[PDB]
Every structure is written in structure tokens, then in C-alpha cells.
Amino acid sequence: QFIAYIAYPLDLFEEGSITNVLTSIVGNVFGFKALRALRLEDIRFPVAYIKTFQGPPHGIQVERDKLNKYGRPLLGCTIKPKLGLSAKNYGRAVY
Amino acid sequence: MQTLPKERRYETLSYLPPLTDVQIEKQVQYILSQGYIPAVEFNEVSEPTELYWTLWKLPLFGAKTSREVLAEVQSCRSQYPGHYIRVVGFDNIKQCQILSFIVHKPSR
Amino acid sequence: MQTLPKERRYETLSYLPPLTDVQIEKQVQYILSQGYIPAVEFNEVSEPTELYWTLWKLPLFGAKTSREVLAEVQSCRSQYPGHYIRVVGFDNIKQCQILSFIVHKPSR
Amino acid sequence: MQTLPKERRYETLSYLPPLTDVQIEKQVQYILSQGYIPAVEFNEVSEPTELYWTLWKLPLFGAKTSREVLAEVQSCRSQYPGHYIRVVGFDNIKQCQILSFIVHKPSR
């Protein structure tokens, strides 16, 4: 059991694409005859590659300004049951 | 079984019982200990739609004691007895508000 | 010939003369005989636009007699004299309301 | 430090202390010396959205002295005490208003 550290050049990956970086690295190295198990522990993105992406549409700081909620954690609720209720009954439970 | 009464609420720390003057002093002490800048804001009407309240004087950039903030809260209270009054705390690094709570409601 | 007077109406059974306590008892008896769950709702304003009314306590899942339902109406009426009050009947199999009628109007 | 009080404003010359009859006479004298046409306008309510005010009589094309303009203001004031009144100056060459200022506010 050993950890292997592998370096990849920046130029081979597409700009602003998670699909490519996932297809290239974790494509078909898994399912190899020479090794019984494989697990990816961590990944490092350089600054130059991060700048291509949009990122989150708003983020933490902008969200709180839009909602006007400061100081505390936000409280949520999931409606039960998962499957069964009517559209009118669903809205009453929400209210 | 009991039914919940209809009541109008005012963001953070509005479900707790109305704050004592010592309780206000302890909350302001937190803002100063952390390093944030305390400020007093006032408005005529409390609505969810509006997100700007009129700023009372300037943010208190130089504040050594929590008593100095309380004296500014009392000044705005005596000037406007029929306005909503809240205490805010600004952070400079993160560039976001860290605390906001209502100290005064329009008297009758 | 006679010209019709302008009068505000309240959905089902609002055109019939005001319902007596015996008549309301018979309508609630109908709900329990079919096997629907009776529930009490109340609202400040009667408008065609709004379709949600604030629920009084919870739906009465274990109701054996129509007297238990009327006792729950009297509790809400004494608490809220100036609110509209209606009785609804939930069906579980069809997943739809079957009967809905107003039992109280704001007094004066 | 001082916090600015909330006050409703009325365009030009509304930040200065209220105009005396001597001061208004000097402002009208300016309009006539240049060669512009003076006029009196009145309205029920002052709003930023509305841009037309009701024209009192007609623009004074044949004005020789500033006393004639002040006499027309006094006539509109006695007739309409609960209306706003302003004095406007029209230019014929550039085709644009040169001066506009409010002389009367609704009394109490």
C-alpha cells in the first residue's frame, strides 16, 4: 500500500471544463489488470487553471446581503413524506 | 395541543425576550473583542423589501469601551422615539456584516 | 320584476339562510359517516385571491362523534371573535378536499 | 459630529432660508432684464414623477415692471391657499426654461 504523486502539465487540459479534467485523470486507470484497487485521495488546482472557471454564481458574502441575514446559521426543513402528497397539501405544509 | 400566535419578527435575536441594558453591553463587547467596527442604524418602517437603513452619524472606528457605543444608542433613542433602531458590526477583511440586532422599537 | 341586491358570498351553502347549530351538526355528521378527516381553519380577511387559511391546531384524525368537532369550533370562536372560521374535510385515498363551508363571520 | 435631518426639498433655492418678498422681487427682476417671459404655475401636490403644473392665466408677454408679476402671484395665492405656487421663466430663442422656483407652499 503506497501513495503515488503524479504531475500533469497545464496545456493538455481544456479551459473551464471539469468534464475534461475528470475524463483525463480518472478515465480508465481504474479497472487495470495489474492492480486490485485504486483510490484518488486529493487533487491540486493551480491558480492559472482556476481563473478559467466561473466558480459559484454568488458565494457566501453576496448571498447574505441579498437575504439580509447576519449573525447566525440559517435554518431549513425538508417536507415528509418524500412521495405521496398533493400539490395543494404540499404548499400547506410549506406555509 | 396549542396554536402559534401571529407575531411580526425582526431578524436575529427577536425570538428571545426583549434585551436588558446589560445584555446589550455584552453583545457590543463581542464586536470589539473580535476587532470589528460597531455602528448604529435607524429607520422609520421595518420591511423585508428594504435593505438600507439611515446611518446615525458615522461608524465608530475609534472605540475603546462598550459604554461609548451605548451612549450613542441612547442619543439616537432620545432623538427619535418613534423609529426602529439597530446595532450593526462591520468587518474589514471579509467585507461583510457579522452581527445585526434591534435595540429599540417605536414606543406605542 | 325585482332587481337583485349586491351581496358578498362565501362559496358553498352561502345562498341558503344562516345555518343553525342543528344544521351544522348534520353537515359534520356527513363528513364522519363518509370517513373523511375534519379540520378547522381561520382567516382575518375573506378574499378570492388567497387560497390558504391558517390551520387551527391540527387535523382531527381520531374523532368519534360530531360533538368533538363543534367543541373545537367554539374554542377558536371564543379566542378569535373577529376572524372568519371554516370547516374542511380531507380525503386520504383521493387526496383532495371534499367539503368546505364557513361556520363563523366577524361579529360587528 | 451631526446627523442630517430628513427634509423634503423643492428643486432650486430650497436649501437656502425661505425667500423674503424683497428677494423674490430681485429674482423676477433678473428674468425681465435678460429678456425672458415670466409665468405663474400652480399644483395640488408636489411630486418628482409629475412634470406638468396647471398654468395660471397665460404667460406674461407684455410685462414692463416686476410689480406686475408679483400682483399675479398674490391673485393666485388668495384664490388657492392650499396649492403649491411657482414662478417660471421661458426663453424663446433656445426654447428652454431658464429659471424655476417655488414661492408658496400649502398653508398648514
Side-chain angles (χ1 to χ4, degrees), chain A, chain B residues 1-63 65-107, chain C residues 1-63 65-107, chain D residues 1-63 65-107:
Chain A
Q1 195 92 326
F2 70 101
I3 310 296
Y5 293 88
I6 300 147
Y8 301 97
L10 177 67
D11 51 35
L12 69 96
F13 299 95
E14 195 177 33
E15 292 93 310
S17 183
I18 291 297
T19 321
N20 200 325
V21 76
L22 208 80
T23 313
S24 191
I25 296 159
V26 300
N28 54 53
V29 282
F30 299 83
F32 221 82
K33 298 269 263 186
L35 49 98
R36 54 155 74 178
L38 192 72
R39 187 168 163 86
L40 186 75
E41 285 294 326
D42 214 317
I43 197 154
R44 180 183 155 271
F45 293 101
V47 174
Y49 195 64
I50 295 159
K51 293 294 276 177
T52 65
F53 294 91
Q54 194 205 256
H58 303 272
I60 299 158
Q61 297 157 352
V62 180
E63 184 204 315
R64 284 192 178 271
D65 293 327
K66 293 184 94 170
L67 295 163
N68 198 43
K69 296 176 186 293
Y70 313 101
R72 58 167 185 87
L74 310 165
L75 299 178
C77 187
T78 318
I79 309 300
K80 300 282 176 186
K82 293 202 270 187
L83 303 150
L85 285 160
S86 177
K88 184 87 187 288
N89 279 25
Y90 201 83
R92 205 196 305 275
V94 168
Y95 164 69
Chain B
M1 290 180 187
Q2 276 275 303
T3 323
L4 190 81
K6 289 188 180 179
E7 205 190 309
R8 207 165 181 89
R9 304 286 186 175
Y10 309 95
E11 279 292 318
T12 321
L13 319 177
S14 57
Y15 286 76
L16 294 160
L19 289 166
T20 327
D21 292 308
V22 188
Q23 290 183 306
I24 300 155
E25 192 187 6
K26 293 171 96 73
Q27 292 294 305
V28 169
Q29 186 63 47
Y30 169 76
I31 305 156
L32 295 162
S33 65
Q34 295 292 309
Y36 312 136
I37 303 102
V40 189
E41 288 188 301
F42 74 101
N43 200 14
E44 200 192 315
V45 190
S46 185
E47 292 293 310
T49 319
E50 60 185 310
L51 43 91
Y52 290 117
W53 285 31
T54 319
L55 193 62
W56 168 264
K57 289 151 94 81
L58 276 169
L60 297 96
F61 302 112
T65 330
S66 59
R67 198 171 279 101
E68 295 294 302
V69 185
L70 286 157
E72 293 289 334
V73 171
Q74 286 173 346
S75 300
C76 189
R77 173 136 57 188
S78 60
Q79 189 75 60
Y80 306 100
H83 280 70
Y84 289 88
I85 304 151
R86 69 183 179 197
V87 181
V88 288
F90 295 106
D91 188 21
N92 59 296
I93 301 152
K94 289 274 183 179
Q95 192 79 294
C96 191
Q97 283 176 225
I98 318 296
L99 185 61
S100 183
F101 64 96
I102 275 170
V103 287
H104 185 72
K105 293 176 192 74
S107 59
Chain C
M1 292 179 195
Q2 270 282 296
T3 321
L4 195 76
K6 300 180 183 179
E7 200 187 306
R8 206 162 180 89
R9 301 288 176 178
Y10 306 97
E11 279 291 324
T12 324
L13 311 171
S14 55
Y15 283 81
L16 294 161
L19 295 159
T20 332
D21 296 303
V22 189
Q23 288 176 305
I24 303 151
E25 196 188 11
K26 289 175 92 72
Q27 292 290 306
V28 172
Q29 188 58 57
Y30 174 77
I31 304 156
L32 294 158
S33 64
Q34 297 287 304
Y36 307 136
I37 301 101
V40 183
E41 284 190 303
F42 68 98
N43 199 8
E44 205 183 342
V45 203
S46 182
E47 294 298 310
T49 320
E50 60 185 313
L51 47 90
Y52 289 121
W53 285 36
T54 312
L55 196 86
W56 171 254
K57 291 150 91 80
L58 280 168
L60 291 94
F61 302 106
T65 320
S66 62
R67 196 173 277 100
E68 294 285 302
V69 182
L70 288 159
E72 288 292 332
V73 177
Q74 288 165 336
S75 296
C76 187
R77 172 141 43 192
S78 58
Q79 191 74 55
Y80 303 95
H83 281 70
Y84 293 88
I85 302 149
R86 73 184 182 199
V87 183
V88 295
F90 296 100
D91 188 9
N92 54 301
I93 311 149
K94 287 273 180 180
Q95 187 63 287
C96 188
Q97 285 174 233
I98 316 299
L99 194 66
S100 184
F101 62 97
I102 280 162
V103 288
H104 185 64
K105 293 175 198 75
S107 59
Chain D
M1 291 190 191
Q2 274 279 299
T3 316
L4 191 83
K6 296 193 177 182
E7 202 192 306
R8 203 159 191 89
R9 302 290 182 180
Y10 306 94
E11 277 296 317
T12 321
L13 313 167
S14 55
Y15 280 81
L16 298 159
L19 293 159
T20 331
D21 292 299
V22 190
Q23 288 186 308
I24 304 151
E25 197 180 8
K26 288 179 90 71
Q27 294 291 309
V28 173
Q29 193 63 56
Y30 171 77
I31 299 158
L32 294 160
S33 60
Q34 295 288 307
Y36 306 133
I37 298 102
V40 183
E41 279 192 302
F42 72 98
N43 200 8
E44 204 180 332
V45 197
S46 186
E47 288 292 307
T49 320
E50 59 185 308
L51 43 90
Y52 292 121
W53 283 33
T54 319
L55 194 72
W56 170 260
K57 288 154 84 80
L58 284 163
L60 292 98
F61 306 109
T65 319
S66 60
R67 194 172 277 102
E68 296 291 311
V69 184
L70 295 158
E72 296 289 350
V73 178
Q74 287 179 330
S75 297
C76 193
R77 172 137 49 192
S78 61
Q79 192 70 52
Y80 305 99
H83 282 73
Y84 290 90
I85 300 152
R86 70 182 176 189
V87 182
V88 289
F90 295 109
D91 187 22
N92 61 309
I93 301 150
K94 289 273 181 180
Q95 193 79 291
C96 197
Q97 281 171 231
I98 307 301
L99 195 69
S100 182
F101 65 103
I102 280 154
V103 286
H104 185 68
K105 292 170 187 73
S107 59

